[PDB]
Amino acid sequence: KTPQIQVYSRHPPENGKPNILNCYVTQFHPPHIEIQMLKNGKKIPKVEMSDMSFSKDWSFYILAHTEFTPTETDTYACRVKHDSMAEPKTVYWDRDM
Amino acid sequence: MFFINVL
Amino acid sequence: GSHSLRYFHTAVSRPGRGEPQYISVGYVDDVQFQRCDSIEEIPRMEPRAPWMEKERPEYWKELKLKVKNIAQSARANLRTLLRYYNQSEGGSHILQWMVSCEVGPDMRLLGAHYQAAYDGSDYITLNEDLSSWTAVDMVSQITKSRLESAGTAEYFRAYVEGECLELLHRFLRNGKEILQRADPPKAHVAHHPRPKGDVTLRCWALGFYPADITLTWQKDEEDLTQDMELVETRPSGDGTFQKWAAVVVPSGEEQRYTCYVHHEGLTEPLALKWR
Ligand SMILES: *[C@@H]1O[C@H](CO)[C@@H](O)[C@H](O)[C@H]1NC(C)=O
């Protein structure tokens, strides 16, 4: 059970307007996992994480999030490491999705 | 907060 | 209308350093109200919802005793499961189970559930009659015979009629403003031209509670389920949820397509087009 990843903002994004960036990681098993959020390819150290829970199919899910103000030039992403994968898995924030 | 022993 | 108290429990036989041997999270409907865990035999509890500030000290003291007992019991059961399946030690194995009770509009009991899984696969399920069990293999068949000849389901009924309903009633009263509400979705259609010349129409729904929602697209009258691109409903992080559903349409025909949003905060589905 490899993790699925969604990266998205709490509110519709607006440049120069503060917001929250979410990394929603789901459908993985076992629960051990590493999640790192990135800005311009570099680790964001100020990341909060919800408690881990699981759904009725027994797979686990968790929400990582961080405060951010979007701009025209900064990129954001979420990188996940799980035993079910040989290599890490990264998903980039797309402001239209 | 409840648990049943299975074996 | 209907409301549910739900607990999601996980026990792990060989956790990594700093990871819990046992963790459970509790919800009323789609709102988490606490986290319990045990790390290196040390139990900890954290409230997650405002109405838990109303609980008297004795609630937390009794909860801590339950965490200790449950963690201890789950570890023992993991030991036994390892032997019945002739599985080697040195590897980490996982025991999960869900506990819940549900009431209807009259706040009277409607149903309850107890279900367990081993290493991510169904192991045993308590049936709707709350007295017989559904097994999946020869080992869980041993469990079924033991529970049914022992009548252990009667002890779960006593938990449901007692503590489960007690807390569910009390949480719904103390957290009425949060739990006995429905926030309807705020919806709009976004327009994204593609190089091919066609167009992505993405129907958004934001700010709704509870999480259950349906987004669908129609052209004229036909439903376009097979043509849609959807995302799983996802938490915005502030207590509300969001979702979108998209179709690819020819340029100049965007007004032929209608998005419908179904949510319990609405009396009829919301219909909208690109504007
Ligand atoms: C498997 O069963 C055999 C015989 O019943 C026993 O000798 C062995 O210890 C078992 N293995 C494990 C890992 O329990």
Walkthrough of the structure:
Chain A: One of its GO terms (molecular function) is protein homodimerization activity. Chain A: Heterodimer of an alpha chain and a beta chain. Beta-2-microglobulin is the beta-chain of major histocompatibility complex class I molecules. Forms a heterotrimer with MR1 and a metabolite antigen. Chain A has strands at residues 4-9, 19-28, 34-39, 42-43, 48-49, 53-54, 60-68, 76-81, 89-92. Chain A starts with a strand and ends in a 5-residue tail after the last strand. Chain A is globular. Chain A has one domain. Chain A is mainly β and 97 residues long. With 7 residues, chain B is largely without helices or strands. In chain B, 0% of the residues lie in helices and 0% in strands. By secondary structure, chain C is α+β, with helices and mostly antiparallel strands. Chain C folds into two domains: 1-181, no CATH class; 182-275, no CATH class. Chain C contains four helices and 17 strands. Chain C has helices at residues 57-84, 138-150, 153-174, 176-179, and strands at 3-12, 22-28, 31-39, 42-47, 94-103, 109-118, 121-126, 133-135, 186-193, 199-208, 214-219, 222-223, 229-230, 234-235, 241-249, 257-262, 270-272. In chain C, strands 4-3-2-1-5-6-7-8 form an eight-stranded antiparallel sheet, covered by helices on one side. The chains are: A mainly beta (97), B little secondary structure (7), C alpha+beta (275). The B-C interface holds B 1-7 and C 7, 9, 24, 26, 36, 63, 66-67, 69-70, 73-74, 76-77, 80-81, 84, 97, 99, 114, 116, 123-124, 139-140, 142-143, 146-147, 152, 155-156, 159, 163-164. 2-acetamido-2-deoxy-beta-D-glucopyranose (NAG) is lined by residues 83, 86-88 of chain C.
